[PDB]
Amino acid sequence: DIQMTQSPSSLSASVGDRVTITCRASQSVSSAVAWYQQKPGKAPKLLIYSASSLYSGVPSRFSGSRSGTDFTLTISSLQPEDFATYYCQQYLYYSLVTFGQGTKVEIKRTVAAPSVFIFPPSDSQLKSGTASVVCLLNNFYPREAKVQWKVDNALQSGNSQESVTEQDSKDSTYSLSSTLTLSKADYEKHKVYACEVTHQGLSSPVTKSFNR
Amino acid sequence: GVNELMKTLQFAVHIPTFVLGLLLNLLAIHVFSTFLKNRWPDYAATSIYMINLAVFDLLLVLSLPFKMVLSQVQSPFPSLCTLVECLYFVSMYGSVWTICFISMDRFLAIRYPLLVSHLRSPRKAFGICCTIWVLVWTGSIPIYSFHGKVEKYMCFHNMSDDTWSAKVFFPLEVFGFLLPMGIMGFCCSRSIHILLGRRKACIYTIAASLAVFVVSFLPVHLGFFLQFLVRNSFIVECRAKQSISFFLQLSMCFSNVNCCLDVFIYYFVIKEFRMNADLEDNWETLNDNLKVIEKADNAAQVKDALTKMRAAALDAQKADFRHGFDILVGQIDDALKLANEGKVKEAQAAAEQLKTTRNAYIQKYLERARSTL
Amino acid sequence: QVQLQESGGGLVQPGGSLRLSCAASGRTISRYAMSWFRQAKEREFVAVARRSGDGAFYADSVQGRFTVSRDDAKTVYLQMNSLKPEDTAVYYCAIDSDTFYSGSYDYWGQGTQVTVS
Amino acid sequence: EVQLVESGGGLVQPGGSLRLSCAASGFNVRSFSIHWVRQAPGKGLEWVAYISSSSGSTSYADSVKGRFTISADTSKNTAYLQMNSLRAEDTAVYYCARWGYWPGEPWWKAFDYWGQGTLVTVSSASTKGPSVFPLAPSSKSGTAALGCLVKDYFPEPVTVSWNSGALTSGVHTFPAVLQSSGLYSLSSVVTVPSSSLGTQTYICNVNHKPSNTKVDKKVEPK
Ligand SMILES: CCOc1cc([C@H]2C(C(=O)Nc3ccccc3OC)=C(C)NC3=C2C(=O)CCC3)cc(Br)c1O
Structure with a gap:
C-alpha cells in the first residue's frame, strides 16, 4: 500500500555526467529506502541501503539523499558499467516492501533517423494459412518510435506486436520489428498495405508500402 | 543642557557597572577556568571563547575607573584619555568578533554535525582568540x-x-x-530554524548571543554611521545635530554595559553545559495511532496505524534512547505480525504493551529532547 | 489552433555564435517537447528539447556546436558556437504532440533564414 | 561469501503446482528473513512472500495471498515457495532474497544478497517447432534488408545464426513476443550492401533445442 514512484522512467546520459533518479513515497518512511542496480538478465545488487548509507562493494559514485518523503540517487560520475536499470525500494516492514517502476539509464548519442523496411509475406505463410508482415526500424535513437500499420489509408489497432532490441554495443542504437498477424483470407481480401513510422528524428512520417 | 545630562548620567551609570563587571566577569573567568579542566575537544573551545570574551570585557571594566577619574576633572591629563578610548574600542571590537566566532562555531556544529569533530578544537580556539586579539589591537x-x-x-x-x-x-x-552582524544574523537565524525544525537550551543560548550582540553593538555603530552621514554629507540643521550628538554620547555611555550584558550569554552557555516539529510530531503520531488502535475493529486499520507508528519510531530514533526505541519498534513488529495473522484483540494487547514500553523508556526522551533541542 | 512563432536569425560570420528563439502561445510548453529543424536538400533534424528532467538531444552535424534550453517553460532557444560554413538553412520549429516523445510533429512553424558569411 | 541458489522453475500448465527451493549458503535461514521477489518479463520487481523460521511469521502480497504457501526447513537451510492455482499472469523470474532481523545494521541493509533467479513460465501450450519464414529483400530497393522470421515455438532456447555465424555485423535478433495463441514469435534481420543483391547466398540457421529442429532457410530476392 506504500506506493513508491520514481519520476524518470528512462533517462539518457553520456559517460561522465550527473545522473539523478528521484523517488517519492505515498506515506512517510523514515529511511527505509534501498536502491538496486539490475543489469539485464541478472539479479539486482544493493547500491544505497538506508536513505544515504553506501553499501560496501560498490563505487563511491553512487550517492543517496532524503528530503522528507522524497528520495534521490546520484551517479554524478558515470562509467561504462553504470548502464542498467535502477530500482527504488521501500522496506518499512517485511510485509509492506514495495519497489519502484525502475529507471533504465541508457547511452546518450546523436539522433538517428530510422531506416524503414517493409517485408511482404512469403508463399510459405500463404500456404500455411497465416499472414505476417513486419516493418523494420533500423539503427535509430532514441527508442521513442511508434509504428502504425495502414491498409487502404486506414489505421489498425491490436493484432500487431512490437519488439525492440537493447542498445547496440557498437553504435548504441535501437531496432524495431512490428509484425501484423492476419488471416490468409483477410490478407487476400485486401490489395495494398503500408507501415507508417514516426520518430523524433523525422520531419514527416515515413510510410513504405507494397502491393500484393 | 546636554552637558549637565551627560555628567549626571555618567556619574550615575558608571558607578554600578564597574562593580557589576568586576564581580560577574571575574566569576565567569573563574568558572570557565575551572571548566577548562574537563579537556574534551568540543567542551573546551567554547570555554576558551568565553574566557576571551570575559578578558575583553574586563579590559573595559578596568578602563571605567580611569575614564571616570580623567573625566571628573577639566582635562588635566590628556595623554591617558587616548589610552582609555583605545581600551574601550579594543573591548568592543574584540567582543564583537568573539561572539561572532561563537555563533560561527554553533552554526557549523548544528548544520554540519561531522565537521565539528575536526573544526572545534581547543588549539584552534586558542589560536583564533590570539589572532583576533592581534588584529583588533593592530586596528x-x-x-x-x-x-x-x-x-x-x-x-x-x-x-x-x-x-x-x-x-x-x-x-x-x-x-x-556590519560583516560580523550580517554573518552572525545568518548563522543564528539558520541555527534557530534548524533547531525548531528538530523540535530549548540551545535555542536560548543562540537567542541570548544574538540579543546581547544587537543590544550592545547596534546602537553605537548606528550612531557612528549616523554621525558619518550627518557631519559629512547632510546640513547641520542644529536640532538634528544636537539630537544625534546626544544619541551617540548616550550609546557611548550605554555600550559600557556590555561587560554586564555578557552575563546573559554566560549563564545560558553554563546552563547548557551543565545539562549536557519533527520530534514533536513524531511523538504526536505515536500517541495518535496508539490511541486509534484501541478504537479499531478491522485488521487493516490497526495495520495502517502500526505502519505509521513504526515509521515515526524509526524517524525519531535518529535524533538509552537507542535501546528504548529499539524495543518500541520491536513491539510494533509483534503487533504488526499479529495484525497480519488476522488476530485483532492480540493486536490490542500488543498495543497496550507498546503503551507501557513508551511510558517507561520513551517519555524520558521528548522531555530531555524538549530541553536541549 | 495553437500559436507558434519563431524569432531570431540573420547572417553572421563563420564563428559568430547566434541565438534563436521559438514562441508558442497555444497550450503549455512544459507539457510537450519541441524540436528544432533545418533545411536548404530535404528537411534535416537538428535538436529536440523535452521536458525538464530527461534532457534534450542533438543531431550528429550540430553535435556540441548547438545547445537548446527549456528556459522558463515559455519557448525553446538555440545557442551557436563554432559555426561551420555548411550551415546555411531556413531553420523551422516544431512541437511533438505525443507525451511519449513519439515525434508525431502535428504542429510546425515558419522559421527564418540563417546564413554564414 | 554467502550465496542463494534457486531451483525448481520451469514449464507448468495453468492451475498447476510447483515448488521453488532457494538454498542458503554462508548463513542460516534462522538468522535472516527470506523473501521472494518476482520480475515479470520486461516488467518491474514485485514482492511475493516472506518467511521467518525464527518466529514462524509468514506473509504474502495481496495479489498472491491464498494461493502460494511459503515454507522454510532450517535443517536443510532452504526456503520453499509452493505454487498453487497458477495463472498466466504469474510467469516471471523469481528471486529469493535475504533480509536481516531487527535491530541494527542487518535490518537496514534491506536485500544485500539476492539469489540468481528461476524463470517460471506458465501457459496452456505445448512444445512445437518454429516455422522459419524468410523475409525477402525489396527488389526495387544502397543497403538492402534481409531476415528470417520464426513463429509458433513454446520454450525460449531459440538461437538464430546467419551463415553458421560467419556474418555478424548488421544482424539484429529481436526479443521474442508472446502471441495471443500462447506461442512465441521472433524475427532476426541482417543488412548487407545491395551491390546487385550482393551475389552472396544468405542462409538463416535457427535452432530450437527443446524441439530439436535445426532448420536452415535460404532467402532470395523476389
Ligand atoms: C579597532 C578600532 O580601531 C579604530 C577605531 C576608530 C573609531 C573612531 C575614532 O576615532 N575613535 C576613537 C576616539 C577616541 C579615542 C580613540 C579612538 O579610537 C581607536 C572614529 C571617529 N570612527 C570609527 C571608529 C571605529 O572603530 C569604527 C568606524 C567608525 C578610530 C581609529 Br583610529 C581606530 O584605529
Missing part, C-alpha cells in the same frame, strides 16, 4: 589620525579630518560591525 593602533602634535583633547573623542572620511570609517565599520 586600534591607527587611532592617531588627527594632527601629529597636540592630539585630541576630549574623552568623548570626536576627532576630525580623515577619521570620518571613507578611508577610515568604512574599513573599520564594515569589517568590525
Whole structure:
C-alpha cells in the first residue's frame, strides 16, 4: 500500500555526467529506502541501503539523499558499467516492501533517423494459412518510435506486436520489428498495405508500402 | 543642557557597572577556568571563547575607573584619555568578533554535525582568540589620525579630518560591525530554524548571543554611521545635530554595559553545559495511532496505524534512547505480525504493551529532547 | 489552433555564435517537447528539447556546436558556437504532440533564414 | 561469501503446482528473513512472500495471498515457495532474497544478497517447432534488408545464426513476443550492401533445442 514512484522512467546520459533518479513515497518512511542496480538478465545488487548509507562493494559514485518523503540517487560520475536499470525500494516492514517502476539509464548519442523496411509475406505463410508482415526500424535513437500499420489509408489497432532490441554495443542504437498477424483470407481480401513510422528524428512520417 | 545630562548620567551609570563587571566577569573567568579542566575537544573551545570574551570585557571594566577619574576633572591629563578610548574600542571590537566566532562555531556544529569533530578544537580556539586579539589591537593602533602634535583633547573623542572620511570609517565599520552582524544574523537565524525544525537550551543560548550582540553593538555603530552621514554629507540643521550628538554620547555611555550584558550569554552557555516539529510530531503520531488502535475493529486499520507508528519510531530514533526505541519498534513488529495473522484483540494487547514500553523508556526522551533541542 | 512563432536569425560570420528563439502561445510548453529543424536538400533534424528532467538531444552535424534550453517553460532557444560554413538553412520549429516523445510533429512553424558569411 | 541458489522453475500448465527451493549458503535461514521477489518479463520487481523460521511469521502480497504457501526447513537451510492455482499472469523470474532481523545494521541493509533467479513460465501450450519464414529483400530497393522470421515455438532456447555465424555485423535478433495463441514469435534481420543483391547466398540457421529442429532457410530476392 506504500506506493513508491520514481519520476524518470528512462533517462539518457553520456559517460561522465550527473545522473539523478528521484523517488517519492505515498506515506512517510523514515529511511527505509534501498536502491538496486539490475543489469539485464541478472539479479539486482544493493547500491544505497538506508536513505544515504553506501553499501560496501560498490563505487563511491553512487550517492543517496532524503528530503522528507522524497528520495534521490546520484551517479554524478558515470562509467561504462553504470548502464542498467535502477530500482527504488521501500522496506518499512517485511510485509509492506514495495519497489519502484525502475529507471533504465541508457547511452546518450546523436539522433538517428530510422531506416524503414517493409517485408511482404512469403508463399510459405500463404500456404500455411497465416499472414505476417513486419516493418523494420533500423539503427535509430532514441527508442521513442511508434509504428502504425495502414491498409487502404486506414489505421489498425491490436493484432500487431512490437519488439525492440537493447542498445547496440557498437553504435548504441535501437531496432524495431512490428509484425501484423492476419488471416490468409483477410490478407487476400485486401490489395495494398503500408507501415507508417514516426520518430523524433523525422520531419514527416515515413510510410513504405507494397502491393500484393 | 546636554552637558549637565551627560555628567549626571555618567556619574550615575558608571558607578554600578564597574562593580557589576568586576564581580560577574571575574566569576565567569573563574568558572570557565575551572571548566577548562574537563579537556574534551568540543567542551573546551567554547570555554576558551568565553574566557576571551570575559578578558575583553574586563579590559573595559578596568578602563571605567580611569575614564571616570580623567573625566571628573577639566582635562588635566590628556595623554591617558587616548589610552582609555583605545581600551574601550579594543573591548568592543574584540567582543564583537568573539561572539561572532561563537555563533560561527554553533552554526557549523548544528548544520554540519561531522565537521565539528575536526573544526572545534581547543588549539584552534586558542589560536583564533590570539589572532583576533592581534588584529583588533593592530586596528586600534591607527587611532592617531588627527594632527601629529597636540592630539585630541576630549574623552568623548570626536576627532576630525580623515577619521570620518571613507578611508577610515568604512574599513573599520564594515569589517568590525556590519560583516560580523550580517554573518552572525545568518548563522543564528539558520541555527534557530534548524533547531525548531528538530523540535530549548540551545535555542536560548543562540537567542541570548544574538540579543546581547544587537543590544550592545547596534546602537553605537548606528550612531557612528549616523554621525558619518550627518557631519559629512547632510546640513547641520542644529536640532538634528544636537539630537544625534546626544544619541551617540548616550550609546557611548550605554555600550559600557556590555561587560554586564555578557552575563546573559554566560549563564545560558553554563546552563547548557551543565545539562549536557519533527520530534514533536513524531511523538504526536505515536500517541495518535496508539490511541486509534484501541478504537479499531478491522485488521487493516490497526495495520495502517502500526505502519505509521513504526515509521515515526524509526524517524525519531535518529535524533538509552537507542535501546528504548529499539524495543518500541520491536513491539510494533509483534503487533504488526499479529495484525497480519488476522488476530485483532492480540493486536490490542500488543498495543497496550507498546503503551507501557513508551511510558517507561520513551517519555524520558521528548522531555530531555524538549530541553536541549 | 495553437500559436507558434519563431524569432531570431540573420547572417553572421563563420564563428559568430547566434541565438534563436521559438514562441508558442497555444497550450503549455512544459507539457510537450519541441524540436528544432533545418533545411536548404530535404528537411534535416537538428535538436529536440523535452521536458525538464530527461534532457534534450542533438543531431550528429550540430553535435556540441548547438545547445537548446527549456528556459522558463515559455519557448525553446538555440545557442551557436563554432559555426561551420555548411550551415546555411531556413531553420523551422516544431512541437511533438505525443507525451511519449513519439515525434508525431502535428504542429510546425515558419522559421527564418540563417546564413554564414 | 554467502550465496542463494534457486531451483525448481520451469514449464507448468495453468492451475498447476510447483515448488521453488532457494538454498542458503554462508548463513542460516534462522538468522535472516527470506523473501521472494518476482520480475515479470520486461516488467518491474514485485514482492511475493516472506518467511521467518525464527518466529514462524509468514506473509504474502495481496495479489498472491491464498494461493502460494511459503515454507522454510532450517535443517536443510532452504526456503520453499509452493505454487498453487497458477495463472498466466504469474510467469516471471523469481528471486529469493535475504533480509536481516531487527535491530541494527542487518535490518537496514534491506536485500544485500539476492539469489540468481528461476524463470517460471506458465501457459496452456505445448512444445512445437518454429516455422522459419524468410523475409525477402525489396527488389526495387544502397543497403538492402534481409531476415528470417520464426513463429509458433513454446520454450525460449531459440538461437538464430546467419551463415553458421560467419556474418555478424548488421544482424539484429529481436526479443521474442508472446502471441495471443500462447506461442512465441521472433524475427532476426541482417543488412548487407545491395551491390546487385550482393551475389552472396544468405542462409538463416535457427535452432530450437527443446524441439530439436535445426532448420536452415535460404532467402532470395523476389
Ligand atoms: C579597532 C578600532 O580601531 C579604530 C577605531 C576608530 C573609531 C573612531 C575614532 O576615532 N575613535 C576613537 C576616539 C577616541 C579615542 C580613540 C579612538 O579610537 C581607536 C572614529 C571617529 N570612527 C570609527 C571608529 C571605529 O572603530 C569604527 C568606524 C567608525 C578610530 C581609529 Br583610529 C581606530 O584605529
